[PDB]
């Protein structure tokens, strides 16, 4: 029913690849 | 029914590739 | 029903690859 | 019903690969 | 019902691979 | 320079009040 | 420079009040 | 420079009040 | 520079009050 | 520079108050 292929070539990663990230940084 | 192929070539990544990101940064 | 193939080639990783990250950094 | 294949080649890892991380860093 | 294969090749690991980590670092 | 006054009366709360929430719920 | 006053009256709380929450719930 | 006053009256708390919470719940 | 006053009245607490919590609940 | 006053009145506590908690509950 559902098929997904992921092929990634990374040299230098400082961020997010195939990832889920949550950051707050709130102020009261 | 559903087919998806992803091929990515990255040299230097400082952001998001195939990713989901949430940031708050709110102020009260 | 559901099939997913992941192939990743990383040289130097300072961030997230196939990961889920949560950070607070809130201030009261 | 559900099948997932993960193949990762890492050279130097300073972050997260196939991982879940939680950080607080909150201030009162 | 559910099948998952993980194959990882790491050279030098300073972070997390297939791991779950919790850090507090809070301040009152 | 900046002044804010918040006064809230809640009977029953199942959601968010003066809060910041992040949810992923992504699928690969 | 910045002044904030918070006054909250809660009867029954099942959610968040003056809080910051992060949830993943991702699937690979 | 920065002043904040918090006054909270809670009857029964099953969630979060003035708190920061992180949950993973990821699946591979 | 920074001043914060917290006054909380709780009857019955089953969750978090002025707290920081991390939970994994991940599955491989 | 930084001043914080905490005054808490608790009747019955089953959770966390001014605390930091880490739980794994992971499965492989």
């Amino acid at each position: 029913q559902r098929l997904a292929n992921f092929l990634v070539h990374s040299g230098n990663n400082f961020g997010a690849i195939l990832s889920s990230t949550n950051v707050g940084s709130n102020t009261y």
Side-chain angles (χ1 to χ4, degrees), chain A:
Chain A
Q1 298 191 41
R2 293 180 176 177
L3 174 53
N5 298 269
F6 305 86
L7 172 53
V8 187
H9 289 85
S10 180
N12 296 125
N13 180 26
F14 304 84
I17 300 184
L18 285 147
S19 298
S20 313
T21 74
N22 292 323
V23 176
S25 289
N26 304 296
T27 302
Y28 292 79

